[PDB]
């Protein structure tokens, strides 16, 4: 129609003006007098071996001790990080797994990938083994991320440019979030578990409301596909990593771009983004086999986590902020402190 | 210094390690092929002769092959193609009868150029299956090949086609020093395609075995 030519575009213009009406100062100017974090040195405290293929996913437990990892060898291993013991080893029906989640209660785990099916596995069974509790189907594209709301609800993002909130007991899609024009690569859940941000391949990250299921907000600025996303611990901001070798801290309340983390020596994309407990340090896994820790308030590279022999595919920080786990394509999980 | 429960947990972890090692040893002995095509280009026929990923397992000469079909993935290929980085070979199916349809041969050529020159398949060999021999013969006796390639200059006989079809497909491989393209002409009823795939996989495994020794 004629209106789509300008009306929507006109609205876009207004939005920019609104953002231009609030960018009186920048984050660097505000946090210019803050003392720098300084050099950050983390050593590889633990190395987890047992995966025989590229590790594509990892998720810490809420007890900050157990962690689940997924590899292309068809294995979902639940690790005791303190003693490097293998608590569980689940063989997956499909070895093309690209994501995994660990339930906050610790009773269930989730996996999914190129099979377009989110498999929920029950860990606390009277039989003493791990069995497929549920197999949620309905996504028409590869399932790239999944996060547990509780023992009964789970949000997933797939390559069909849609997200879905599933009720596990019924196995149906309680809600469907649409609006992305590209593959959704990652999603993050807010601490209050009422909103969630999903970054897609259209170089945009959308804030959705879980309750009613509508796109509350849209954030742009990236020049390539967004591969990772993570909320600030406060819950009023988030960080996105993309393929243009740039991380970006966006603001929910200001609905703008707060800060950009990039270096000229970095030309490789970001595969994973995570925050520390206080939010001062932003950890990002890169394709150059490294993992950079930035001063989230100063856009200064505080440190480099360089041990891995292949692309750092997944990254996580414990809820108590005591350790950072990195999983790379060299089939090794490394805990840093 | 461990307690009884901790020692038993360590024993369970060691048993899990043993099972994982056995499973990995079993998986490493299996051949993984990635089946690609331009849609309805003979992939179904090739699968017959031997939602998401479709895995087909078949045993030939005491060798287990797993073909992964990605036809159901309508999303962006570059976001998940790196999963198939360790496949022994890529079976690319091209229908010879699609040269005068809509252009479609040009689409197959573009797909082959994208797959062969991908940054992940820098050393993964490609087995090229040119399907529909008989229908191609019928359509080339009547319709000249100049419809697909305006620059063609040759007779319109079935003796054509490897030269100026397979040659054009192989010229898209501008990394010839690192990989080889195995081209085979096949039809509906051949029963020799499995043997050709086995021979190509033997060559690939010999090359990889040598690279492992450093000989290469």
């Amino acid at each position: 129609l004629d209106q789509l030519r300008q009306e929507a575009e006109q609205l876009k213009n207004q939005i920019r003006d609104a953002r231009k009406a609030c960018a009186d100062a920048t984050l660097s100017q505000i946090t210019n007098n803050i003392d720098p974090v300084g050099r950050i040195q983390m050593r590889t405290r633990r190395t987890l071996r047992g995966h025989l293929a590229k590790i594509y996913a990892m998720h810490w437990g809420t007890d900050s001790r157990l962690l689940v990892s997924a590899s292309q060898d068809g294995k979902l291993i639940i690790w005791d990080s303190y003693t490097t013991n293998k608590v569980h080893a689940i063989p997956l029906r499909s070895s093309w797994v690209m994501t995994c989640a660990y339930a906050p209660s610790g009773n269930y785990v989730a996996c999914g990938g190129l099979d377009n099916i989110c498999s929920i596995y029950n860990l606390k069974t009277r039989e003493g083994n791990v069995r497929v509790s549920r197999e949620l189907a309905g996504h028409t594209g590869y399932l790239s991320c999944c996060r547990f709301l509780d023992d009964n609800q789970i949000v997933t993002s797939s390559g069909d440019t849609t997200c879905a909130l599933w009720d596990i007991e019924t196995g149906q899609q309680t809600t469907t979030f649409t609006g992305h024009t590209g593959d959704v690569m990652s999603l993050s859940l807010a601490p209050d578990t009422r909103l969630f941000v999903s970054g897609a391949c259209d170089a945009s990250a959308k804030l959705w409301d879980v309750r009613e299921g509508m796109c509350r907000q849209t954030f742009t600025g990236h020049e390539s596909d967004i591969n990772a996303i993570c909320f600030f611990p406060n819950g009023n901001a988030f960080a996105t990593g993309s393929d243009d070798a740039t991380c970006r801290l966006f603001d929910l309340r200001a609905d703008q771009e707060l800060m950009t983390y990039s270096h000229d020596n970095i030309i490789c994309g970001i595969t994973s983004v995570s925050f520390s407990k206080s939010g001062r340090l932003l950890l990002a896994g890169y394709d150059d086999f490294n993992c950079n820790v930035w001063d989230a308030l100063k856009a200064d590279r505080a440190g480099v986590l360089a041990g891995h022999d292949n692309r750092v595919s997944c990254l996580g920080v414990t809820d108590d902020g005591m350790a950072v786990a990195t999983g790379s394509w060299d089939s090794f999980l490394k805990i840093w402190n | 210094t461990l307690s009884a429960e901790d020692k038993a947990a360590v024993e369970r972890s060691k048993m899990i390690d043993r099972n994982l090692r056995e499973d990995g040893e079993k998986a490493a002995r299996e051949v993984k092929l990635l089946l690609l095509g331009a849609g309805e280009s003979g992939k179904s026929t090739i699968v017959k002769q031997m939602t998401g990923i479709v895995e087909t397992h078949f045993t030939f000469k005491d060798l287990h092959f797993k073909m992964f079909d990605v036809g159901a993935q309508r999303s962006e290929r570059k976001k998940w193609i790196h999963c198939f980085e360790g496949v022994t070979a890529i079976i690319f199916c091209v229908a010879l009868s699609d040269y005068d349809l809509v252009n479609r041969m040009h689409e197959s050529m573009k797909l082959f150029d994208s797959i062969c020159n991908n940054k992940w398949f820098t050393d993964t060999s490609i087995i090229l299956f040119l399907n529909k021999k008989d229908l191609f013969e019928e359509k080339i006796k009547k319709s000249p090949l100049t419809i697909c390639y305006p620059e063609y200059a040759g007779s319109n006989t079935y003796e054509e086609a490897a030269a100026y079809i397979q040659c054009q497909f192989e010229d898209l491989n501008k990394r010839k020093d690192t990989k080889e393209i195995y081209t085979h002409f096949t039809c509906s009823t051949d029963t020799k395609n499995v043997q050709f795939v086995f021979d190509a996989v033997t060559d690939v495994i010999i090359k990889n075995n040598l690279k492992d020794c450093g000989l290469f």
Partner: single-chain antibody, 233 residues
Framework: DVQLVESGGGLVQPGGSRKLSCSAS????????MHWVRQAPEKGLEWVAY????????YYADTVKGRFTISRDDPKNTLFLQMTSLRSEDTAMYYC??????????????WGQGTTLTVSSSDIVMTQATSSVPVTPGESVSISCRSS???????????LYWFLQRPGQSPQLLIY???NLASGVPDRFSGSGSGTAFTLTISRLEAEDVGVYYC?????????FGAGTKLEL
């Protein structure tokens, strides 16, 4: 359902030999360590033997080492106890217990029904002092236990278990590692305490709670049970 049905009991002449079998159904027998635990007629429980998962670790009590032997047939899901040179002290009801060991696991979840074997004519000490406590239903009861050696390991876990044996029934797990409540146990039970001094508190003592309470240690391996405190009325 999960069950351990066992047989092999009866009357045995002294100096003989008998084979006790325990068929397990309803759970992954291969992934569970298995314990043989005997209870003499009227003097509480006593741990006897243990086979690990995969049969990689075998343990026996001091009073049955060498004399007894324990094995498992995983394909047939069976646990065997070959017990020879039997004496008058071996008459007891034997129980087949499952226990899986990993982080956060609950050992000694399920106990078998027990088979009576009647013969025709270091070592942490667990003490419970009081053996009989008569309390009317509806009140709160505290049951005490003590150990010769502190059960608080360097890991932070305190390996003590609280079991209940109801009249004419097999022992049931209530508390594992002194703080955790076993699955299916009502919340009215609560275990607490520190090394060398442990307690189990029942807030609203209802019916079907009368029985004998045992405190067991798991820090050293010759596992030892308490004398047993019995609840009346």
């Amino acid at each position: 359902d999960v069950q351990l049905v066992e047989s092999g009991g009866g009357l045995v002449q002294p100096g003989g030999s008998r084979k006790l079998s325990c068929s397990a159904s309803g759970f992954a027998f291969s992934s569970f360590g298995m314990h043989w635990v005997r209870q003499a007629p009227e003097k509480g429980l006593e741990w006897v033997a243990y086979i690990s998962s995969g049969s990689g670790t075998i343990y026996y009590a001091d009073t049955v080492k060498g004399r007894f032997t324990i094995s498992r047939d995983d394909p047939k899901n069976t646990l065997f106890l070959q017990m020879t040179s039997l004496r008058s002290e071996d008459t007891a009801m034997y129980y087949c217990v499952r226990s899986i060991y990993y982080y956060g696991s609950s050992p000694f979840d399920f106990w078998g029904q027990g088979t009576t074997l009647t013969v025709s004519s270091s070592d942490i000490v667990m003490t419970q002092a009081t053996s009989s406590v008569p309390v009317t239903p509806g009140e709160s009861v505290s049951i005490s236990c003590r150990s010769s050696k502190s059960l608080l390991h360097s890991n932070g876990n305190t390996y003590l278990y609280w079991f209940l044996q109801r009249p004419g029934q097999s022992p049931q797990l209530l508390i594992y590692r002194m703080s955790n409540l076993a699955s299916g146990v009502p919340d009215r039970f609560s275990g607490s305490g520190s090394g060398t001094a442990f307690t189990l508190t029942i807030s609203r003592l209802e019916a079907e709670d009368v029985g004998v309470y045992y405190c067991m240690q798991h820090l050293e391996y010759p596992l030892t049970f308490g004398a047993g405190t019995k609840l009346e009325l």
